[PDB]
Amino acid sequence: RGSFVEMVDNLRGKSGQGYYVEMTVGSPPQTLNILVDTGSSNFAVGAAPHPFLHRYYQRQLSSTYRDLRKGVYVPYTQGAWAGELGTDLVSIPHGPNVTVRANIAAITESDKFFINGSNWEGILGLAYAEIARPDDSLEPFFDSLVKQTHVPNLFSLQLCGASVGGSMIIGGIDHSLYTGSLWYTPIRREWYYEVIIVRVEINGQDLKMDCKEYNYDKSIVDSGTTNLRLPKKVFEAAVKSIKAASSTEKFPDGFWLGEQLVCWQAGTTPWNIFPVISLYLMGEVTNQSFRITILPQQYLRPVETSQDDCYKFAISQSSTGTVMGAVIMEGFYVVFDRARKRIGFAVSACHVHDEFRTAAVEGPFVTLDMEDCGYNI
Ligand SMILES: [Cl-]
């Protein structure tokens, strides 16, 4: 038992449907399952019946609910919801031992937002105010937490893939959750958790694209996204290289597009067929980088006959930059060190691997002119 032991194993989820934490809202208490999303900045909860919701927030039963008399609308990559803003008391029973008055969006209508069978009823946007709706004046949850209490301005995520679970440690780091050393990359700007990717390798083979392409028009760390999403030119090069490294086997074109699944008989997946993938990230010292390496166990996602194990290729094309989603995060313990404007990676104690290969975090490397990689708006 480390000091943060009561926050260990506080996340649950279904594979590919996101990881959620229990949050208790209002008075008397209403506890809901809440998607942990480092790619957005609103705290919002289902607040009316929906066919995919087991429960929802009932404002009329909360004596401490305060109406802000303002509507709110959030479009996501393809889901959207509409609702009403207010504030209420919020605690995380398997999180920090504090209660805060936070902004909460009560979701009254939605389109393709709630996911049948996901078990979550709302979303906790952990990114910065810049990207909050309706605007940056709506204080996000984590900002409220830090302003109102002693809790240190840091949280960390261990997402354990392939019924999923994990840990969100709030206000610190738990050393049981990782092995080896933590390596940090700067948060380039406080909006999304924006980072800079400086090199990409597939089975040790450099893709050799200009680093500006890897970060066009941003690279972010996003726990609410399943895939590793890559800019079009990078995606095309990566697929070409992954195909070449997996030459022993042939797969249809649509498999690489995520439009076709390939299944193996139970327990026979030739993980060895597929290459490891490395992203080099900008380090904390001039001209210094480090690399994170994931396995096919991370980027080939099981889709749940019981004797067949089917997989989807979970690297996909993006037109809004690189997104380091669960495919990346499931290899690592990831420290969102807001106080020091940096994100840490270490090998996860829970990551899915085999007897031959493991995810890795290695450094240092020498990479020159990294200040040129970032996109400028
Ligand atoms: Cl605490």
Side-chain angles (χ1 to χ4, degrees), residues 45-49 59 81-84 106-110:
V45 301
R59 289 165 288 169
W81 58 257
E84 298 163 5
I107 298 166
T108 55
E109 301 289 354
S110 60

Side-chain angles (χ1 to χ4, degrees), residues 124-129 131-132 134-146 148-164:
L124 177 61
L126 290 166
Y128 298 94
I131 61 166
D135 59 43
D136 73 1
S137 72
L138 193 75
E139 186 172 82
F141 176 82
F142 206 87
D143 290 80
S144 297
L145 172 65
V146 170
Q148 290 174 42
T149 78
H150 68 283
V151 174
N153 189 21
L154 176 157
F155 66 92
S156 59
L157 290 172
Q158 189 208 46
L159 309 182
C160 305
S163 203
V164 296

Side-chain angles (χ1 to χ4, degrees), residues 183-186 198 280-291 362-368 370:
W183 286 86
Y184 291 89
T185 195
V198 301
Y280 290 64
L281 299 171
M282 177 186 289
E284 290 211 286
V285 166
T286 302
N287 298 331
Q288 170 264 322
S289 63
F290 65 96
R291 78 181 174 211
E362 294 159 325
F365 301 96
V366 177
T367 309
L368 310 171
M370 294 187 290

Side-chain angles (χ1 to χ4, degrees), residues 7 95-98 150-151 170:
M7 306 193 200
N97 190 24
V98 301
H150 68 283
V151 174
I170 294 164

Side-chain angles (χ1 to χ4, degrees), residues 146 148-204 206-207 209-231 233-249 251-271 274-300 302-303 308-354 356-365:
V146 170
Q148 290 174 42
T149 78
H150 68 283
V151 174
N153 189 21
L154 176 157
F155 66 92
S156 59
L157 290 172
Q158 189 208 46
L159 309 182
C160 305
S163 203
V164 296
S167 301
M168 175 172 60
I169 310 301
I170 294 164
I173 293 165
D174 186 305
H175 306 292
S176 76
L177 301 183
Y178 69 99
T179 60
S181 291
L182 278 156
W183 286 86
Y184 291 89
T185 195
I187 294 168
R188 186 180 179 221
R189 182 155 75 86
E190 294 155 300
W191 59 320
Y192 298 95
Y193 291 100
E194 185 188 358
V195 298
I196 293 287
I197 294 164
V198 301
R199 186 180 171 106
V200 177
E201 296 176 346
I202 289 160
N203 255 5
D206 189 349
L207 276 188
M209 303 182 68
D210 193 294
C211 67
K212 289 178 172 82
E213 298 287 0
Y214 301 143
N215 306 287
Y216 172 68
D217 59 345
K218 65 182 177 288
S219 294
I220 70 169
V221 185
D222 181 4
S223 65
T225 290
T226 295
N227 290 357
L228 171 59
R229 306 182 72 240
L230 299 171
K233 298 176 189 153
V234 183
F235 173 76
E236 293 177 14
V239 169
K240 182 170 158 70
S241 178
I242 293 161
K243 280 182 178 171
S246 62
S247 266
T248 294
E249 303 286 334
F251 301 103
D253 284 353
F255 170 75
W256 307 109
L257 300 171
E259 293 167 0
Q260 297 177 249
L261 279 52
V262 177
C263 316
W264 282 263
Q265 284 181 314
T268 67
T269 307
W271 301 112
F274 297 92
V276 302
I277 298 179
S278 302
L279 301 181
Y280 290 64
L281 299 171
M282 177 186 289
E284 290 211 286
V285 166
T286 302
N287 298 331
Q288 170 264 322
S289 63
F290 65 96
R291 78 181 174 211
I292 62 173
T293 301
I294 60 161
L295 308 180
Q297 282 92 331
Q298 278 72 243
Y299 66 80
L300 300 185
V303 179
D308 304 287
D309 295 338
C310 299
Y311 296 88
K312 186 181 183 206
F313 182 67
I315 305 175
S316 64
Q317 186 180 330
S318 175
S319 65
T320 63
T322 293
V323 184
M324 301 166 61
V327 164
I328 290 291
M329 293 187 71
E330 286 175 8
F332 311 105
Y333 185 44
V334 181
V335 180
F336 295 77
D337 185 353
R338 294 161 54 109
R340 292 179 69 168
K341 285 182 43 74
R342 62 184 191 163
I343 295 168
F345 294 80
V347 179
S348 175
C350 76
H351 80 99
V352 173
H353 61 278
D354 60 44
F356 309 106
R357 297 187 291 196
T358 165
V361 182
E362 294 159 325
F365 301 96

